Amino acid sequence: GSSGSSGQIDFQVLHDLRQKFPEVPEVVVSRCMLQNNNNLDACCAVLSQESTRYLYGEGDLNFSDDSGISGPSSG
């Protein structure tokens, strides 16, 4: 039961995340923010649980289908 109205991605909020989750693909992150009406923690969390889903694999019972692979590997 969405009450508020969907806004526009919040970079400032993303950046903050980008730092916490730099490895994670922004494109993916966004899809998260756009879902959390652009949030920091609310995202960080989802990102924390999501990451693992994209990393070690598996996590939570939340459904999320989206293609995106990024292997930068620092060095």
Q: Per-residue DSSP letters for 2-71?
A: --S------HHHHHHHHHHSSSS-HHHHHHHHTTTTS-SHHHHHHHHHHHHIIIII--SS----------
Whole-angstrom CA distances from 10 to 50, 52, 58, 63, 66 are: 19, 23, 28, 23, 21
Q: Is 60 exposed, middle or buried (0-12, 13-18, 19+ CB in 10 A)?
A: exposed
* CATH architecture type of domain 1-75: Orthogonal Bundle (1.10)
Kindly list the domain boundaries of the chain, sorted by start residue. 1-75
Q: What is the DSSP string of 38-55?
A: S-SHHHHHHHHHHHHIII
